[PDB]
From Swiss-Prot:
Giardins are involved in parasite attachment to the intestinal mucosa and in the cytoskeletal disassembly and reassembly that marks the transition from infectious trophozoite to transmissible cyst. They may interact with other cytoskeletal proteins such as microtubules in the microribbons or crossbridges, to maintain the integrity of the ventral disk. Coiled coil: none annotated. Disulfide bonds: none annotated. SMART domains: ANX. Belongs to the annexin family. Giardin subunit alpha subfamily. It holds the Pfam family ANXE1_4th. InterPro entries: Alpha_giardin (IPR008088), Annexin_repeat (IPR018502), Annexin_sf (IPR037104). It comes from Giardia intestinalis. This is Giardin subunit alpha-1. SUPFAM superfamilies: Annexin (SSF47874).
Length: 294
């Protein structure tokens, strides 16, 4: 329907103050569509769309979530990236903000970090994060976004992985996951599992621990596909006792790109259900709506 009438619907949801109905309208349209609806909306009422959401509803993550959803994806990201560095490194936020991201989104997020804070995002990050652990080095690699093709053959490149894993060539490792193109990763990993006795995800388990462990484990989910990384992040968000911050970072930032998470989630169970469980009566309905499990 006309983006003009869509803006109206929100305005009446924002009048009703109905968090779920706003969230529902959100769920209906991708980030780009929600950008067009945001415009229609400000011309209509001379009110910034996030500014009205903030207005009607007072609260926490639930509020901020609905705002993010009608705000510049890349600014939202650059602020999250600003925040995770503000106090002490928020690794959980790193994952959500660095690894759970397309190369395009990332790019504008870089650019948006300049507009906002007159700084080079990647400089700030390597400043705070350092280069002492593998997870740091991986993260720098990932952020560059230079996917280089791999010298043919899954199996052949799979056996090269598993050897890097055995010897503990954490250099190959970093560079692989830092550069392997996603399309090329799926076959390699299917192959790893078909030949090397241990899934890649177990390989990591053997070699890495703590925040080293999680970074690659996120990596591997993300090269399979964002909806896969998402599903996991959501799950982690569930076990960390309904992590509303994580859930707000990744949803308001990425839902449109990751709607298949509900199916990916099946390996952990029913997404709809677990959120009913882990998240309270305010946040959960909002969440179930966005990720389309009502
Ligand atoms: Ca408020
Ligand atoms: Ca709450």
């Amino acid at each position: 329907p006309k983006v003009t009438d869509i803006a109206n619907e929100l305005k009446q949801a924002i009048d009703a103050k109905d968090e779920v109905q706003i969230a529902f309208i959100a769920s209906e349209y991708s980030a780009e569509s929600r950008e067009k609806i945001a415009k229609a909306y400000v011309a209509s009422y001379g009110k910034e769309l996030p500014d009205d959401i903030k207005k009607a509803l007072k609260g926490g993550s639930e509020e901020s979530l609905l705002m993010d959803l009608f705000s510049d994806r890349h600014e939202v990201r650059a602020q999250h990236i600003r925040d995770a560095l503000s106090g002490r490194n928020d690794h959980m936020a790193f994952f959500d903000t660095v690894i759970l991201c397309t190369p395009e989104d990332w790019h504008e997020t870089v650019a948006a970090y300049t507009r906002m804070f007159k700084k080079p995002l990647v400089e700030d990050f390597m400043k705070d994060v350092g280069r002492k652990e593998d997870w740091c080095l991986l993260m720098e690699k990932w952020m560059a976004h230079e996917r280089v093709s791999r010298p043919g053959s899954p199996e052949d490149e799979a056996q090269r992985l598993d050897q890097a894993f055995d010897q503990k060539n954490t250099a190959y490792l970093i560079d692989f996951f830092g550069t392997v193109p996603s399309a090329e990763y799926r076959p390699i990993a299917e192959a790893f599992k078909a030949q090397n006795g241990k899934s890649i995800e177990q390989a990591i388990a053997t070699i890495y621990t703590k925040t080293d462990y999680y970074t690659f484990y996120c990596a591997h989910f993300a090269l399979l596909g964002m909806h896969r990384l998402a599903a996991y992040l959501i799950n982690c968000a569930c076990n960390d006792k309904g992590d509303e911050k994580r859930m707000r970072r990744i949803t308001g930032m990425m839902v449109d790109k990751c709607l298949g998470a509900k199916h990916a989630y099946k390996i952990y169970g029913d997404m709809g259900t677990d959120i009913e469980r882990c998240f309270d009566k305010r946040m959960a309905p909002i969440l179930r709506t966005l990720w389309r499990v009502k």
